[PDB]
From a paper:
The C. difficile antigen CD0873 is annotated as a substrate-binding protein component (SBP) of an ATP-binding cassette (ABC) transporter and is an immunoreactive protein in human infection. We have previously shown, using both genetic and cellular approaches, that CD0873 is a surface-exposed lipoprotein and an adhesin of C. difficile. CD0873 assumes a typical Class I or Cluster B SBP-fold. The protein possesses two domains, each consisting of an α-β-α sandwich joined by three loops that form a hinge.
The closed, ligand-bound structure was determined to a resolution of 1.35 Å; the semi-open, ligand-bound structure was determined to 1.80 Å; and the open, ligand-free structure was determined to 2.50 Å. The closed structure has a tyrosine molecule (retained during purification) bound. The structural and biochemical information reported in this study demonstrates that tyrosine is the ligand of CD0873. The exquisite specificity of CD0873 for tyrosine is likely achieved through the tyrosine OH group. This is hydrogen bonded to the side chain of Glu-263, and to the main chain carbonyls of Val-235 and Pro-236 through a water molecule. In VC_1101 and SP1069, Glu-263 is replaced by an alanine: the lack of an appropriate hydrogen bond donor in these proteins explains their preference for more hydrophobic amino acids. Gln-284 in SP1069 aids binding of tryptophan through a hydrogen bond to the indole nitrogen; this glutamine is replaced by a tyrosine in CD0873 and VC_1101, which prevents binding of the larger tryptophan side chain through steric hindrance. CD0873 has a tyrosine molecule bound, whereas VC_1101 has phenylalanine bound and SP1069 has tryptophan bound. Comparison of the structures shows that the proteins share a common mechanism of binding to the amino and acid groups, but show sequence differences that account for their side chain preferences. DSF analysis strongly suggested, in agreement with the crystallization studies, that CD0873 specifically binds tyrosine (p < 0.0001).
Residue numbers in the entry: 44 to 338
């Protein structure tokens, strides 16, 4: 029986979706929990020390494979073991996180999928929902390398395309209230990168932003379900399913160190119709938009 450890940072929609897809891929390929695999699922509940203790225990348990969901969980798994294969998902920038040498040839015990998406995809939506906006706010966790890379990308785009960026770096969930509140009066739109801290506090961000008539564009649909206005993002269940197919390969003997990291080029526009209505906006004509209601 192959023993798989799954280390997930926290329940937020994107991370949950990757776990769902990964398990379905393994099952479709004949690997079934309680039969020829054992899945030990561990949630850190957003606690950074717990990402490290989960990973430590998976290494001392001698798991056959570790599936790590998010940058923090992956970094912890990599710190814990350089021998057990680690498959990642929902990692924005595996190279910047120190997990792989290159995407095409990791050269380490880590491979999997990246949730990289260009800032351009979300900022395209300004033409639709805030066509006169000139100042973009971004709140993010200064401890997440995934977020730092995306903020740099945002600033590069803004410098190219005539926008101002106002940053609010935080490190704790207790800072969210004053952080979003402080951006009121100073921004035309909020961009939410794939930041685990902010994604976990989206209902708060949404409530204050929407009361202040600030559109919030997120990088992916989880925050939209939790009260952001819109996104043009990837499908995280599919990303997880791809990672499970790569697991099948590793369980069957393929070398993780030569397995290329996979990404998705397929995005979909999803809008929260409740938030749209609260902002006094009309549904645009665009046939490719799908609508969600608040989770
Ligand atoms: N990209 C994040 C995970 C994440 C995904 C979706 C989000 O909305 C937020 C965070 C990481 O590298 O850890």
């Amino acid at each position: 029986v192959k023993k798989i450890g799954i280390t997930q940072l926290v329940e937020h929609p994107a991370l949950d979706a990757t776990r769902t897809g990964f398990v379905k891929a393994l099952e479709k390929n004949g690997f079934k929990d309680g039969e020829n695999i054992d899945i030990d699922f561990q949630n850190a509940q957003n606690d950074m020390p717990t990402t490290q203790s989960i990973a430590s225990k998976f290494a001392s348990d001698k798991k056959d494979l570790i599936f790590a969901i998010s940058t923090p969980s992956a970094q912890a798994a990599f710190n814990a073991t350089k021998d057990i294969p680690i498959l990642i998902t929902a990692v924005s920038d595996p190279v910047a996180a120190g997990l792989v040498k290159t995407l095409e040839k990791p050269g380490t015990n880590v491979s999997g999928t990246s949730d990289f998406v260009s800032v351009d995809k979300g900022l395209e939506l300004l033409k639709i929902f805030a066509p006169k906006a000139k100042t973009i706010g971004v709140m993010y966790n200064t401890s997440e390398v995934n977020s730092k890379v995306q903020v740099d990308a945002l600033k590069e785009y803004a410098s190219k395309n005539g926008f101002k960026v106002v940053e609010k770096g935080i490190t704790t969930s207790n800072e969210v209230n004053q952080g979003i509140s402080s951006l009121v009066g100073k921004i035309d739109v909020l961009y939410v990168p794939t930041d685990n801290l902010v994604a976990s506090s989206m209902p708060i961000v949404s409530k204050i932003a929407t009361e202040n008539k600030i559109p919030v564009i997120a990088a992916e649909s989880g925050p939209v379900e939790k009260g952001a206005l819109a996104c043009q993002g990837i499908n995280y269940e599919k990303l997880g399913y791809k990672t499970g197919e790569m697991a099948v390969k590793i369980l069957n003997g393929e070398s993780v160190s030569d397995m290329p990291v996979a990404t998705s080029d397929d995005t979909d526009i999803i809008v929260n119709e409740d938030i749209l209505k609260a902002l006094g906006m009309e549904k645009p004509s665009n046939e490719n938009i799908s609508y969600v209601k608040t989770k």
